[PDB]
Ligand binder design. Structure first.
Ligand SMILES: C[C@H](CCCC(C)(C)O)[C@H]1CC[C@H]2[C@@H]3CC=C4C[C@@H](O)CC[C@]4(C)[C@H]3CC[C@]12C
Length: 436
């Protein structure tokens, strides 16, 4: 049907009625074919680096050239600050990819494919037009199905820029049918020997009643550097804190302590992350400059090998039949193909249980950060980067919502684990089957 027919359709009405009985698992809802996306969540990891030049920029800034690598402030105080400004610009640049890509390619936000345990998605940004850049690799793996958890790493060996992280969510519907989403997990970016800890923001899905879903961000995100510098990004939409949707205000401080006083902000950035934003240095409001305009720089999609040469665990290869059925809009075929894949997985889980076998993750391992870890689990190292960055930001190391600070209600929750997924580069180095 035409999108103008979605909202009043029998299918959508049935879907909305099933929300009143939501059990916490989004996959239990009856999503009509018109609201389905043929893209799996394991693919979302690619949204962290669709602007290759911004991802790598920090690695080109040093003590001898930093003032030439800060467009909005050729008088920037230090290379550490120039790099924080670059990391902040990169982070803001990821937002349109992360949260607006389906609206552009599908017409609205839609239900992504729920990845199967073990699902992989790999590719690379060859950066052919920039030999100094080198190849940037993406590795994404579904490390959990119950609940869904995606782990990923994006790395550029040539310039020593590496990123790793994981993601999972908890969702709930309000009585007004707003889908509230809390993200869990964090991402770490290493620029040579300098590190940055990034926490994703909470969000909500609007437009459910009218069958035209879209994401709006809320809350805050943090970017804590090993240099002590901290960027605090606050999100809002429509009105109340801004005159337009997809808005934000970011402030960079010398350290976490200073972030307690907005007046101590070294720079203040404001605007729309899906559009343009300006930056002000100190309190010189009369001298604002353009910081980033998402509309001027088209996203660069990574190179993925043809389906013909993909391993059975690779996302597009595995979901091929379902994706085809979704594109055809065939109700019965979508049900048939999806059930075939998911039933096969259920059978595997039951077999492993009967034989006393467990599923082994491929390139990531869960590290128990709790004081009393499981006797067989892996434990963090001495100079763990996450621990030092979390300490500097006074961030909870428990499995609380992303960005939870020590002492917050979520951090004071009883019997809360502290297990975090970490990339094991050695496992990729010794990979014997998967290629790019
Ligand atoms: C599961 C729901 C859709 C449910 C639709 C329904 C209720 C009709 O089935 C989707 C919609 C928006 C999706 C998020 C979009 C962006 C991101 C950022 C990425 O880095 C991690 C995944 C995440 C949080 C998506 C999760 C799934 C979401 C909420």
């Amino acid at each position: 049907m035409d999108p103008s027919q979605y909202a009043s359709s029998s299918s959508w009405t049935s879907f909305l009625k099933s929300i009143a009985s939501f059990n916490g698992d989004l996959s239990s809802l009856s999503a009509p074919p018109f609201i389905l996306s043929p893209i799996s969540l394991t693919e979302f990891s690619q949204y962290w680096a669709e602007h290759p030049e911004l991802f790598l920029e920090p690695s080109f800034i040093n003590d001898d050239n930093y003032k030439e690598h800060c467009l909005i402030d050729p008088e920037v105080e230090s290379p550490e600050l120039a790099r924080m400004l670059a990391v902040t610009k990169w982070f803001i640049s990821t937002l349109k990819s992360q949260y607006c890509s389906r609206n552009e390619s599908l017409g609205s936000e839609k239900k992504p494919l729920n990845p199967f345990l073990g699902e992989l998605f790999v590719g690379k940004w060859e950066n052919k037009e920039h030999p100094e850049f080198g190849e940037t690799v993406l590795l994404s793996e579904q490390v959990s199905h119950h609940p869904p958890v995606t782990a990923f790493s994006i790395f550029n060996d040539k310039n020593k820029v590496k990123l790793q992280g994981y993601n999972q969510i908890k969702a709930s519907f309000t009585k007004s049918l707003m889908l509230t989403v809390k993200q869990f997990g964090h991402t770490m970016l290493d620029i040579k020997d300098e590190s940055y800890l990034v926490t994703p923001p909470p969000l909500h899905i609007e437009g459910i009643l009218v069958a035209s879903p879209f994401v709006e961000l809320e809350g805050k995100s943090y970017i804590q550097s090993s240099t002590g510098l901290l960027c605090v990004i606050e999100f809002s939409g429509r009105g109340y804190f801004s005159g337009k949707k997809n808005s934000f205000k970011a402030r960079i401080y010398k350290d976490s302590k200073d972030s307690k006083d907005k007046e101590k902000a070294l720079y203040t950035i404001s605007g729309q992350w899906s559009g343009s934003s300006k930056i002000i240095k100190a309190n010189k409001k009369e001298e604002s400059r353009l910081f980033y305009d998402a509309a001027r720089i088209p996203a660069e999609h990574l190179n993925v090998k043809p389906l013909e040469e993909q391993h059975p665990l690779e996302s597009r290869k595995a979901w091929y039949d379902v994706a085809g059925a979704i594109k055809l809009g065939d109700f019965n075929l979508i049900a048939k193909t999806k059930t075939e894949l998911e039933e096969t997985q259920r059978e595997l889980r039951k077999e492993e249980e009967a034989k006393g076998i467990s599923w082994q993750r491929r390139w990531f391992k869960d590290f128990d950060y709790s004081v009393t870890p499981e006797e067989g689990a892996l434990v963090p190292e001495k100079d763990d980067t996450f621990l030092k960055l979390a300490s500097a930001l006074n961030l909870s190391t428990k499995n609380a919502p992303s960005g939870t600070l020590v002492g917050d209600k979520e951090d004071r929750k009883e019997d809360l684990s502290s297990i975090h997924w970490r990339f094991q580069r050695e496992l990729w180095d010794e990979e014997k089957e998967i290629v790019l």
